[PDB]
Design a binder for this molecule. Structure first.
Ligand SMILES: O=C(Sc1nnc(C(F)(F)F)[nH]1)c1ccc(C#Cc2ccccc2)o1
Ligand SMILES: O=C(Sc1nnc(C(F)(F)F)[nH]1)c1ccc(C#Cc2ccccc2)o1
Lengths: 306, 306
């Protein structure tokens, strides 16, 4: 029993974190086989950020412009290229600790673990959701760029995020491991700001199923609803519209608890309209949206507390 | 910026998790040097739990009664002893992945990271506080016994918890790595239940300092309070009494923000009496108590957003 925001064990990722220095700038890189990945803005100094031309800034660099440190070991750069917003440094050593891995581009609403790192040293791990507005509410200080997000599937690390910047509201933006940004953000200091966010409906529903699996039914009701009628209430409360695809995804959870998706939607609608009446769900006083249907099946018992 | 329940990177602990089987019971053990630690109740079958005599149950076991699996490798038991509520199995191999470590007994209110494990395979990591009532609100399913709690200090792993059982309210109980229980709990199936809990005052205060360090001051006020006057409000709201020691501990945070501890206490008192007025603190609608003063200094910027 219980329910917590759980991260994946971070060991396989810890063994891949290095430090990358270019001139006066240091940040984290990711060492897989004989390549180190890092934010290209490592090449930018104390004025470049405002309007950098990375093509131009990089052509002026040599292989020995870059200092890569794996622990106390110094790695030798023997090549470099730019891939979108990432630098790809080739090194003379292959990381013996490289896990089985892939690079994936995660969709909004999906969750992953972040290994916060400073000077190539892991300092903490926590679970994040990719917001509908393509930001994450992380916990990052100066020096955290190059910290990565990931999921672990059996023995395979699916890397899906690399940290690049903080936006004015204190939220965070970055790229996939191909260097393409999530959201309309760019790696330069501009007026860019997070667009308006919405609550992740599908995740709230999954979480309500987790609460039932864990034995709680107080918020249920005898009503049902249609998709369209639900979505009118959804938009009033700034929730993402529910789609048939989302209903389909909730099938396994619906089957395990014997509660129809649209009946759970009627429950949510009531909770949204009436509030929670001083009561809690899975220890929370608010409706949580950073657990996916996958996260619930992963964490919750396969048998429900009927 | 941002503020999240952050766990320590779990790598050093992952490399220490093994599987221990006795008869039909399997759970997790901790492999440090040539010793495996695990809950002694691994020796108990499908009726022993009710009223087991561990001395008697253990004397009937040989070294080969115990099956220890580190990955796919089988470790050979070459000795065993009981230490309080733990078994101490000596093995023919020394764990090459043993980190620098110590065993510590944590105090109520303090926090640590839990590596949830099943069949000796780490599955997740999350941050927990030791409640005043000596339980933790973990996330555990059948097979999680032997999962450990820890803090990491530089290169040193301070182990402080091993999981033994779930109590009726769904909360969790276990021991330090000397096998002594936290709380009045025992490793047998009885009517034992968590005593009444209280909110960890010192942690709520630390967290209010974190909110200020991160730039938020809305909840402050022009009032001050005495310890005694605060504690009268504290007991009305089921908060731990504040002591001079707790005030002393909050010194560094108080200095960084320029807010007197007793002035922060007046703020808390107002928040307790008036509520939060639909507003949030560090993204929370409630007063959080699972971050210590240490956790705040670790996670927050050393310079405040004045
Ligand atoms: O702490 C951070 S994140 C960070 N700051 N430095 C690093 C390093 F690259 F790792 F060194 N990482 C921070 C502070 C301020 C900002 C910013 C910003 C910003 C806001 C709006 C538009 C463009 C840029 O990020
Ligand atoms: O899922 C768990 S924790 C757990 N259950 N099994 C293991 C194993 F040892 F790892 F195998 N760990 C569970 C379910 C039910 C209980 C219990 C209980 C209990 C409640 C009151 C008094 C004494 C015992 O714990």
């Amino acid at each position: 029993s219980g329910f917590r925001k759980m991260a994946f064990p971070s060991g396989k990722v810890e063994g891949c974190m290095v430090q990358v220095t270019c001139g006066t700038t240091t940040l984290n890189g990711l060492w897989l086989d004989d390549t180190v990945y890092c934010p290209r803005h490592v090449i930018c100094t104390a004025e470049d950020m405002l309007n950098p031309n990375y093509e131009d800034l990089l052509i002026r660099k040599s292989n020995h412009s870059f200092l890569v440190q794996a622990g106390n070991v110094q790695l030798r750069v023997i090549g470099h290229s730019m891939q979108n917003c990432l630098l790809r440094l080739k090194v003379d050593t292959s990381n013996p600790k490289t896990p089985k891995y892939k690079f994936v581009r995660i969709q909004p609403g999906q969750t992953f673990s972040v290994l916060a790192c400073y000077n190539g040293s892991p300092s903490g791990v926590y679970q994040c959701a990719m917001r509908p507005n393509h930001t994450i509410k992380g916990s990052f200080l100066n020096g955290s760029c190059g910290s990565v997000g990931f999921n672990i599937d059996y023995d395979c690390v699916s890397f899906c995020y690399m940290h690049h910047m903080e936006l004015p509201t204190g939220v965070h933006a970055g790229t996939d491991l191909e260097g393409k940004f999530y959201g309309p953000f760019v790696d330069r200091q501009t007026a860019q700001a997070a667009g308006t966010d919405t609550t992740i409906t599908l995740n709230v529903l999954a979480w309500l199923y987790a609460a039932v699996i864990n034995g709680d039914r107080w918020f249920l009701n005898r009503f049902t609803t249609t998709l369209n009628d639900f979505n009118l209430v959804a938009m009033k409360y700034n929730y993402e519209p529910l789609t048939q695809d989302h209903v389909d995804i909730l099938g396994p959870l619906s089957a395990q608890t014997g509660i129809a998706v649209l009946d759970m939607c009627a429950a949510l609608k009531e909770l949204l309209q009436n509030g929670m009446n001083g009561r809690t769900i899975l220890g929370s006083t608010i409706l949580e949206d950073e657990f996916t249907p996958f996260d619930v099946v992963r964490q919750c018992s396969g048998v429900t507390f009927q």
